[PDB]
Amino acid sequence: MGFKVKLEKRRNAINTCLCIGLDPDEKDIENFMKNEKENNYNNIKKNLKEKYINNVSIKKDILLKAPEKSEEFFYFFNHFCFYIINETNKYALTFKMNFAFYIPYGSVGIDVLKNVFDYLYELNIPTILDMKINDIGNTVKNYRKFIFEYLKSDSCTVNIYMGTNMLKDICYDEEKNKYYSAFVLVKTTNPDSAIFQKNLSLDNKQAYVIMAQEALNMSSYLNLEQNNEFIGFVVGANSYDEMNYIRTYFPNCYILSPGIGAQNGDLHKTLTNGYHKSYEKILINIGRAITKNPYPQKAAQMYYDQINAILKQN
Amino acid sequence: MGFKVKLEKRRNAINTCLCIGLDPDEKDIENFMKNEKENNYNNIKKNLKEKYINNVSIKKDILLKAPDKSEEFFYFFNHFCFYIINETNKYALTFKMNFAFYIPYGSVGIDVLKNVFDYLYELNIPTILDMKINDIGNTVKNYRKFIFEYLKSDSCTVNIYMGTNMLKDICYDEEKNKYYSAFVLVKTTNPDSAIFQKNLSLDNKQAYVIMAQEALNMSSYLNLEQNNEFIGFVVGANSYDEMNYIRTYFPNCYILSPGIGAQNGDLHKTLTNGYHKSYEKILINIGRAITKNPYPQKAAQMYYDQINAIL
Ligand SMILES: O=c1ccn([C@@H]2O[C@H](COP(=O)(O)O)[C@@H](O)[C@H]2O)c(=O)[nH]1
Ligand SMILES: O=c1ccn([C@@H]2O[C@H](COP(=O)(O)O)[C@@H](O)[C@H]2O)c(=O)[nH]1
């Protein structure tokens, strides 16, 4: 229907802006495999009872077999992702998945990535692919096809330092007359992100302000928000004094904020600075704090309740 | 094994700085399949006669089949890349392959990319993966493993706008005590690349300059060049005023320059601005002008001879 409408519907459904990050590393997979075998696959057996696992399109036969040795890594990697989604999805307004974690093993991880997006799409849960794509317009069309046609993602992240015009070939497809949403990197959770995003300037404005400004110019040029799509901003949770300014200077803009949890922020200051009455425009991404926690559903609910309490106090 | 030594060794062997870009699109694959079907698989049959094709590690049971299905697209895509490598590798100092062209179909294209790097690695031809990676240090280690451990690439491209420190987790691996090379995006061939790389500045030095300096400071901090690795710059062929500034201000730097051919540059002016006696420090990337040309070897030789004349 459009990412804007889809986000706004689900926010009424579950009343949160929590964005769960699903970034499984190699140690998450082996710990999951060892724990399932020592506990008689209690989580995997629960996955196979879930409805939508019968609708994934890649190696469905292998995935539904009860515990083909070369497929062992594919099996537990994919089932670990189902486990996290099954355990925590009721608290998630959005799921964000970083492309880097699904490529380091070659094609096998892309098949897992495809199944994860198929799974979330049948749950009708909004998705974000954190791929931070950037290239010339001819080349970036390949990224658009992978993100929005193959995976059927709702959105992705973009690094427009090479030029804002790349958004014309990411957020718009003239041949299908289709519109897509994206989050451009504005201020990032790197400790040394300032050297370029702060200390560079044009007309006594810091680079992140000018980059956010240029991003919205492209958004209006492509008429995304008339098609219920948008171009948003990635603003790190630790950047409290740029967050305010983004919300103040650009009201009604969508912000994706990572850095709470594994990178050690303060949730109240982040959410209040980026707050908006439509709080789907202030997505709080929490990944490793949930996915590496021993009781993931318990962890998701903890951050779910904390976010709602800070919303009420707004 | 070091990238600096590998580049300079091969440069003496074939005496060129041509970088052949292998960016096959959807129509390159369909056209290759169509012509192979019309002409009794003459190029695919030539690919299977090569000794080194046995060195690919993914689905060799399909790749080495006589030409004959769900595996049909994978087969012709993979063989098209081998076809180009077989036709043109004698003129290439390095091969650069842009990750974007290998992902849009899902995992199948990554299998081709792996086999392509396997093929080039056994031919001992230097490789570049044009992926322009950028992320936090924890995340980018995954790119380093995919690029330098899985594909065994010699180098890749990086966008350090998120912070120079990501190079610490790309060009160096503390657990293995291994060093890798990279090319940082400095000035790009976008028509509107100026909006950020030119008009942004610190104390009236343009953003690309401060990014280039910050890139080499990181290279010196990691002691890359004593481990026969380096950090280089991506400087567009059309940017003659910055190409010359980089060559003078950073005299011994490695430069990777794309944009000649399909993006309508002038080879003489680009190469002269960035020239260095060790001309492996000025790689000229040519992609579509060769891969989309009807006679790829003839086009590669055309640019090879043209580059050699400019010296
Ligand atoms: O400025 C940014 C942009 C994106 N991410 C991504 O967000 C996720 C953070 O998850 P975690 O730190 O909660 O585990 C990772 O995928 C990371 O690459 C950041 O951490 N900071
Ligand atoms: O500033 C840049 C940086 C990288 N590339 C890459 O170089 C190749 C262009 O070669 P060609 O096919 O245009 O000849 C593509 O992979 C493209 O993504 C550019 O064209 N311009």
Tab-separated table of all heavy atoms in Angstrom, chain B residues 168-206, unseen atoms left out:
chain	number	residue	atom	x	y	z
B	168	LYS	N	40.596	0.336	9.795
B	168	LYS	CA	41.309	-0.514	10.744
B	168	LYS	C	40.767	-1.937	10.730
B	168	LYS	O	41.518	-2.898	10.948
B	168	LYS	CB	41.188	0.079	12.150
B	168	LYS	CG	41.872	-0.703	13.263
B	168	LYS	CD	43.329	-0.308	13.421
B	168	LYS	CE	43.974	-0.959	14.648
B	168	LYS	NZ	43.453	-0.420	15.944
B	169	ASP	N	39.480	-2.094	10.440
B	169	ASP	CA	38.825	-3.390	10.440
B	169	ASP	C	38.643	-3.959	9.044
B	169	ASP	O	38.079	-5.047	8.901
B	169	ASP	CB	37.471	-3.270	11.133
B	169	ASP	CG	37.609	-3.035	12.614
B	169	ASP	OD1	38.051	-3.961	13.327
B	169	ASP	OD2	37.288	-1.913	13.057
B	170	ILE	N	39.110	-3.253	8.022
B	170	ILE	CA	39.097	-3.726	6.647
B	170	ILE	C	40.490	-4.147	6.197
B	170	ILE	O	40.690	-5.266	5.729
B	170	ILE	CB	38.516	-2.645	5.705
B	170	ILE	CG1	37.051	-2.378	6.040
B	170	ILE	CG2	38.683	-3.056	4.255
B	170	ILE	CD1	36.529	-1.075	5.482
B	171	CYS	N	41.472	-3.263	6.361
B	171	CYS	CA	42.813	-3.482	5.847
B	171	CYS	C	43.709	-4.268	6.794
B	171	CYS	O	44.833	-4.611	6.413
B	171	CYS	CB	43.461	-2.138	5.511
B	171	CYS	SG	42.576	-1.248	4.189
B	172	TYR	N	43.241	-4.580	7.997
B	172	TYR	CA	44.040	-5.318	8.959
B	172	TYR	C	43.154	-6.295	9.712
B	172	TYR	O	42.009	-5.979	10.049
B	172	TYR	CB	44.736	-4.392	9.960
B	172	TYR	CG	45.555	-5.164	10.965
B	172	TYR	CD1	46.633	-5.934	10.550
B	172	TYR	CD2	45.246	-5.146	12.317
B	172	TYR	CE1	47.389	-6.657	11.446
B	172	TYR	CE2	46.000	-5.866	13.231
B	172	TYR	CZ	47.072	-6.622	12.784
B	172	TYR	OH	47.840	-7.349	13.670
B	173	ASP	N	43.686	-7.488	9.958
B	173	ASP	CA	43.002	-8.511	10.743
B	173	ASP	C	43.922	-8.914	11.890
B	173	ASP	O	44.932	-9.590	11.675
B	173	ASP	CB	42.622	-9.706	9.868
B	173	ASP	CG	41.841	-10.769	10.622
B	173	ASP	OD1	41.694	-10.676	11.860
B	173	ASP	OD2	41.333	-11.697	9.960
B	174	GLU	N	43.563	-8.503	13.109
B	174	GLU	CA	44.419	-8.750	14.264
B	174	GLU	C	44.504	-10.232	14.602
B	174	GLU	O	45.553	-10.699	15.060
B	174	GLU	CB	43.902	-7.968	15.472
B	175	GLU	N	43.432	-10.990	14.355
B	175	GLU	CA	43.426	-12.400	14.732
B	175	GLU	C	44.359	-13.223	13.855
B	175	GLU	O	44.929	-14.215	14.323
B	175	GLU	CB	42.002	-12.961	14.668
B	176	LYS	N	44.536	-12.834	12.593
B	176	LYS	CA	45.376	-13.575	11.662
B	176	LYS	C	46.689	-12.876	11.351
B	176	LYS	O	47.534	-13.456	10.658
B	176	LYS	CB	44.619	-13.832	10.354
B	176	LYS	CG	43.332	-14.619	10.514
B	176	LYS	CD	42.426	-14.428	9.317
B	176	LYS	CE	41.698	-15.708	8.947
B	176	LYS	NZ	41.549	-15.830	7.471
B	177	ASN	N	46.876	-11.645	11.833
B	177	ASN	CA	48.054	-10.838	11.529
B	177	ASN	C	48.267	-10.730	10.017
B	177	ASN	O	49.352	-10.987	9.487
B	177	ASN	CB	49.290	-11.401	12.235
B	177	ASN	CG	50.477	-10.465	12.159
B	177	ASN	OD1	51.576	-10.870	11.772
B	177	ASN	ND2	50.260	-9.199	12.512
B	178	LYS	N	47.194	-10.370	9.314
B	178	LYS	CA	47.206	-10.224	7.867
B	178	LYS	C	46.785	-8.811	7.483
B	178	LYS	O	45.976	-8.178	8.167
B	178	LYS	CB	46.285	-11.259	7.201
B	179	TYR	N	47.352	-8.319	6.384
B	179	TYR	CA	47.083	-6.980	5.881
B	179	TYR	C	46.496	-7.062	4.476
B	179	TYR	O	46.829	-7.957	3.689
B	179	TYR	CB	48.347	-6.115	5.868
B	179	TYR	CG	48.952	-5.895	7.236
B	179	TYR	CD1	49.751	-6.865	7.831
B	179	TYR	CD2	48.724	-4.716	7.934
B	179	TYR	CE1	50.300	-6.668	9.081
B	179	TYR	CE2	49.276	-4.506	9.184
B	179	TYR	CZ	50.061	-5.486	9.751
B	179	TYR	OH	50.607	-5.282	10.996
B	180	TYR	N	45.603	-6.122	4.175
B	180	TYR	CA	44.882	-6.096	2.913
B	180	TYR	C	44.915	-4.679	2.361
B	180	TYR	O	45.117	-3.715	3.101
B	180	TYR	CB	43.434	-6.572	3.100
B	180	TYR	CG	43.313	-7.905	3.818
B	180	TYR	CD1	42.632	-8.000	5.024
B	180	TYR	CD2	43.883	-9.064	3.296
B	180	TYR	CE1	42.513	-9.207	5.688
B	180	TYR	CE2	43.772	-10.280	3.956
B	180	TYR	CZ	43.079	-10.343	5.151
B	180	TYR	OH	42.959	-11.541	5.818
B	181	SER	N	44.706	-4.549	1.055
B	181	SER	CA	44.722	-3.247	0.406
B	181	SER	C	43.313	-2.794	0.050
B	181	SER	O	42.387	-3.601	-0.076
B	181	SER	CB	45.585	-3.259	-0.861
B	181	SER	OG	46.819	-3.913	-0.647
B	182	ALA	N	43.166	-1.481	-0.122
B	182	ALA	CA	41.871	-0.883	-0.405
B	182	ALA	C	42.060	0.403	-1.196
B	182	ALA	O	43.132	1.013	-1.186
B	182	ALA	CB	41.088	-0.604	0.885
B	183	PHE	N	40.991	0.815	-1.877
B	183	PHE	CA	40.922	2.098	-2.570
B	183	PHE	C	39.754	2.874	-1.983
B	183	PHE	O	38.620	2.386	-1.985
B	183	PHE	CB	40.726	1.925	-4.075
B	183	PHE	CG	41.865	1.251	-4.788
B	183	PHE	CD1	41.828	-0.109	-5.054
B	183	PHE	CD2	42.934	1.992	-5.266
B	183	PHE	CE1	42.857	-0.725	-5.749
B	183	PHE	CE2	43.964	1.383	-5.958
B	183	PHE	CZ	43.925	0.022	-6.199
B	184	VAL	N	40.021	4.061	-1.478
B	184	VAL	CA	38.988	4.873	-0.846
B	184	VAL	C	38.395	5.808	-1.887
B	184	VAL	O	39.110	6.339	-2.744
B	184	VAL	CB	39.570	5.657	0.348
B	184	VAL	CG1	38.580	6.672	0.853
B	184	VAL	CG2	39.960	4.705	1.466
B	185	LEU	N	37.082	6.011	-1.818
B	185	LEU	CA	36.418	6.919	-2.743
B	185	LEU	C	36.807	8.350	-2.404
B	185	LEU	O	36.512	8.836	-1.309
B	185	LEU	CB	34.901	6.753	-2.673
B	185	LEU	CG	34.292	5.380	-2.943
B	185	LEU	CD1	32.774	5.429	-2.722
B	185	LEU	CD2	34.644	4.872	-4.340
B	186	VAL	N	37.466	9.021	-3.338
B	186	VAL	CA	37.901	10.405	-3.165
B	186	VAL	C	37.114	11.338	-4.071
B	186	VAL	O	36.446	12.259	-3.602
B	186	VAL	CB	39.419	10.550	-3.404
B	186	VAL	CG1	39.808	12.018	-3.371
B	186	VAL	CG2	40.187	9.765	-2.357
B	187	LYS	N	37.178	11.110	-5.372
B	187	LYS	CA	36.434	11.879	-6.351
B	187	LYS	C	35.796	10.912	-7.338
B	187	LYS	O	36.493	10.086	-7.934
B	187	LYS	CB	37.373	12.865	-7.057
B	187	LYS	CG	36.695	13.792	-8.013
B	187	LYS	CD	36.031	14.975	-7.380
B	187	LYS	CE	34.937	15.366	-8.344
B	187	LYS	NZ	34.201	16.566	-7.978
B	188	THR	N	34.478	11.010	-7.505
B	188	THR	CA	33.723	10.027	-8.268
B	188	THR	C	33.124	10.629	-9.532
B	188	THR	O	32.933	11.843	-9.649
B	188	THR	CB	32.609	9.402	-7.419
B	188	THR	OG1	31.754	10.429	-6.907
B	188	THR	CG2	33.198	8.604	-6.277
B	189	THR	N	32.813	9.740	-10.477
B	189	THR	CA	32.341	10.076	-11.816
B	189	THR	C	30.862	10.445	-11.874
B	189	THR	O	30.319	10.548	-12.977
B	189	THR	CB	32.621	8.915	-12.779
B	189	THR	OG1	31.790	7.794	-12.449
B	189	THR	CG2	34.080	8.502	-12.727
B	190	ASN	N	30.190	10.606	-10.739
B	190	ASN	CA	28.816	11.084	-10.765
B	190	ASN	C	28.774	12.488	-11.361
B	190	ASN	O	29.689	13.289	-11.129
B	190	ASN	CB	28.223	11.109	-9.354
B	190	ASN	CG	28.333	9.775	-8.656
B	190	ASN	OD1	29.435	9.321	-8.347
B	190	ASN	ND2	27.192	9.141	-8.389
B	191	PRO	N	27.743	12.821	-12.137
B	191	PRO	CA	27.604	14.216	-12.579
B	191	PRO	C	27.452	15.187	-11.422
B	191	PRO	O	27.941	16.321	-11.513
B	191	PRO	CB	26.349	14.190	-13.460
B	191	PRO	CG	26.196	12.775	-13.897
B	191	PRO	CD	26.908	11.888	-12.914
B	192	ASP	N	26.789	14.783	-10.334
B	192	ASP	CA	26.563	15.651	-9.183
B	192	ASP	C	27.449	15.285	-7.993
B	192	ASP	O	27.095	15.562	-6.845
B	192	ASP	CB	25.092	15.638	-8.768
B	192	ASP	CG	24.637	14.293	-8.237
B	192	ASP	OD1	25.243	13.253	-8.588
B	192	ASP	OD2	23.659	14.283	-7.456
B	193	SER	N	28.608	14.668	-8.250
B	193	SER	CA	29.529	14.327	-7.172
B	193	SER	C	30.075	15.563	-6.466
B	193	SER	O	30.616	15.446	-5.360
B	193	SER	CB	30.690	13.481	-7.705
B	193	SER	OG	31.346	14.115	-8.787
B	194	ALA	N	29.972	16.736	-7.096
B	194	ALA	CA	30.550	17.947	-6.527
B	194	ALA	C	29.820	18.392	-5.270
B	194	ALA	O	30.436	19.000	-4.387
B	194	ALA	CB	30.539	19.068	-7.565
B	195	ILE	N	28.516	18.101	-5.174
B	195	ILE	CA	27.680	18.668	-4.114
B	195	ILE	C	28.279	18.407	-2.737
B	195	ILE	O	28.173	19.242	-1.831
B	195	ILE	CB	26.242	18.123	-4.217
B	196	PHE	N	28.923	17.255	-2.558
B	196	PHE	CA	29.554	16.902	-1.290
B	196	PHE	C	31.073	16.842	-1.333
B	196	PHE	O	31.721	17.298	-0.389
B	196	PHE	CB	29.014	15.561	-0.785
B	196	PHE	CG	27.533	15.551	-0.566
B	196	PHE	CD1	26.738	14.567	-1.126
B	196	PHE	CD2	26.934	16.526	0.221
B	196	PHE	CE1	25.374	14.562	-0.913
B	196	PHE	CE2	25.573	16.525	0.436
B	196	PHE	CZ	24.789	15.543	-0.130
B	197	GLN	N	31.672	16.286	-2.388
B	197	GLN	CA	33.122	16.115	-2.379
B	197	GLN	C	33.864	17.403	-2.720
B	197	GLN	O	35.039	17.550	-2.359
B	197	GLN	CB	33.535	14.996	-3.342
B	197	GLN	CG	32.597	13.794	-3.341
B	197	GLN	CD	32.741	12.891	-4.570
B	197	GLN	OE1	33.507	13.176	-5.493
B	197	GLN	NE2	31.987	11.796	-4.582
B	198	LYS	N	33.199	18.350	-3.381
B	198	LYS	CA	33.801	19.626	-3.749
B	198	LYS	C	33.341	20.780	-2.869
B	198	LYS	O	34.174	21.490	-2.299
B	198	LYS	CB	33.494	19.951	-5.214
B	198	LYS	CG	34.307	19.150	-6.203
B	198	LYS	CD	34.058	19.617	-7.637
B	198	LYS	CE	34.930	20.797	-7.997
B	198	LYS	NZ	36.366	20.406	-7.988
B	199	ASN	N	32.028	20.992	-2.759
B	199	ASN	CA	31.514	22.186	-2.099
B	199	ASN	C	31.553	22.104	-0.579
B	199	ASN	O	31.438	23.141	0.085
B	199	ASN	CB	30.087	22.466	-2.565
B	199	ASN	CG	29.988	22.597	-4.068
B	199	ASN	OD1	30.988	22.837	-4.744
B	199	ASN	ND2	28.782	22.451	-4.598
B	200	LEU	N	31.712	20.913	-0.010
B	200	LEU	CA	32.004	20.805	1.410
B	200	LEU	C	33.495	21.028	1.623
B	200	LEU	O	34.322	20.621	0.801
B	200	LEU	CB	31.590	19.435	1.944
B	200	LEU	CG	30.098	19.107	1.973
B	200	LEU	CD1	29.890	17.650	2.365
B	200	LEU	CD2	29.371	20.034	2.932
B	201	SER	N	33.842	21.692	2.721
B	201	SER	CA	35.239	22.029	2.940
B	201	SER	C	35.484	22.244	4.425
B	201	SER	O	34.564	22.522	5.195
B	201	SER	CB	35.657	23.265	2.132
B	201	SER	OG	34.976	24.432	2.564
B	202	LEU	N	36.752	22.121	4.804
B	202	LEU	CA	37.229	22.471	6.139
B	202	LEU	C	38.427	23.392	5.958
B	202	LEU	O	39.462	22.974	5.428
B	202	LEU	CB	37.623	21.230	6.947
B	202	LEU	CG	38.357	21.503	8.267
B	202	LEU	CD1	37.743	20.764	9.442
B	202	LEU	CD2	39.837	21.143	8.152
B	203	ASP	N	38.278	24.643	6.399
B	203	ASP	CA	39.333	25.645	6.294
B	203	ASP	C	39.773	25.813	4.840
B	203	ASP	O	40.962	25.906	4.531
B	203	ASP	CB	40.504	25.294	7.212
B	203	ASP	CG	40.056	25.036	8.639
B	203	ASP	OD1	39.153	25.756	9.114
B	203	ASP	OD2	40.589	24.104	9.282
B	204	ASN	N	38.788	25.822	3.942
B	204	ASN	CA	38.986	26.039	2.507
B	204	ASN	C	39.865	24.973	1.855
B	204	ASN	O	40.589	25.253	0.897
B	204	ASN	CB	39.518	27.444	2.223
B	204	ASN	CG	38.403	28.465	2.128
B	204	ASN	OD1	37.232	28.134	2.330
B	204	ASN	ND2	38.753	29.706	1.814
B	205	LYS	N	39.810	23.747	2.373
B	205	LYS	CA	40.303	22.567	1.676
B	205	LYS	C	39.075	21.720	1.375
B	205	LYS	O	38.258	21.475	2.269
B	205	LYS	CB	41.307	21.780	2.520
B	205	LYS	CG	42.679	22.413	2.664
B	205	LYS	CD	43.529	21.627	3.668
B	205	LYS	CE	44.328	20.496	3.023
B	205	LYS	NZ	45.685	20.929	2.570
B	206	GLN	N	38.946	21.265	0.135
B	206	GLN	CA	37.726	20.565	-0.237
B	206	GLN	C	37.669	19.176	0.396
B	206	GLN	O	38.685	18.592	0.791
B	206	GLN	CB	37.582	20.492	-1.756
B	206	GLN	CG	37.511	21.863	-2.413
B	206	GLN	CD	37.351	21.802	-3.918
B	206	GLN	OE1	37.751	20.834	-4.566
B	206	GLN	NE2	36.757	22.843	-4.485
